[PDB]
Design a protein around this ligand. Structure first.
Ligand SMILES: O=C(O)c1c(/C=C2\c3ccccc3C[C@H]2O)ccc2c1OCO2
Ligand SMILES: O=C(O)c1c(/C=C2\c3ccccc3C[C@H]2O)ccc2c1OCO2
Lengths: 148, 149
């Protein structure tokens, strides 16, 4: 549970926002890319697993599940790559709701930055710091409890 | 102390590696950029502060200390921007030693990736997971969780 993350890909301004959500906390990291390829998804997972103890990733679609580049980065970083099937259906709606929330945040900061990637990082910041404890607090508590 | 980070810039293959080190743990994040500008450093700090509770950053040089874009991102993200002067001089050597270790890791993985940026992220990974026995990644999470609680 502390090591489980979900990939999610959403579209804005003709670009792709790739998101990794730490399932137990709601904590996110995200990046803007021109389009979702295995190459970009593999690089993004390497960055994520170098920063947090990523044990399991539920991939966002069958192309990234299949991708031999994604499989190679999962092997390299010690990550169990799984499918993203919402066997519990509440998962479908939870990701949908996060994409809407994120885009709503993005629209609240959009005029403060020239480039989409900056507005996405401001949104990552606002999402992780929002008290609901924040997601950022929750992930650190979860993983610290796991270490002890 | 849990909120204090140090910026560090080093050079490799004609490119720049920008590093933020969490001083109490030794945990790092890093990126490759074509050259260190206020613009890149501001964007890097925004990314960092969206991911960890960054309270204070000791900037790596007076150009980033002065940069109005860097000051704007520090204001936006709630970060206290400070100079990076090694008032304890053991700081000068500690950062040098980190750049040499990092570059050594980079040379141990370099042939596994076409692009420098990938080898740098593999080095970030190996550095944060190295048990020295707790790893830096363990240390930063323990420090911050202690601080929340
Ligand atoms: O070769 C690259 O630099 C490269 C690669 C390649 C690999 C890679 C990347 C991550 C983890 C292990 C590995 C094993 C390795 O094959 C993949 C995506 C990228 C890359 O550049 C940006 O997106
Ligand atoms: O305008 C951008 O998108 C942009 C900016 C601009 C700002 C910015 C960036 C971070 C935090 C607050 C702010 C306030 C804001 O002025 C700066 C660097 C960049 C950018 O693009 C990538 O590197």
């Amino acid at each position: 549970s502390p090591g489980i993350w979900q990939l999610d890909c959403t579209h804005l301004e003709g670009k792709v926002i790739l998101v990794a959500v730490h399932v137990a906390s709601g904590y996110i990291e995200a990046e803007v890319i021109p389009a979702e390829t295995g190459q970009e998804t593999a690089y993004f997972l390497l960055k994520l697993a170098g920063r947090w103890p990523v044990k399991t990733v539920h991939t966002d679609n069958g192309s990234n599940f299949t991708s031999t580049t994604v499989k190679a980065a999962c092997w390299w970083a010690g990550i169990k790559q799984e499918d993203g099937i919402p066997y519990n259906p509440q998962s479908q709606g939870v990701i949908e709701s996060m994409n809407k929330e994120l885009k709503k945040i993005i629209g609240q900061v959009r005029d403060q930055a020239e480039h989409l990637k900056t507005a996405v990082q401001m949104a990552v910041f606002i999402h992780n710091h929002k008290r609901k404890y924040s997601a950022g607090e929750r992930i650190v508590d979860i993983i610290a409890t796991d270490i002890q």
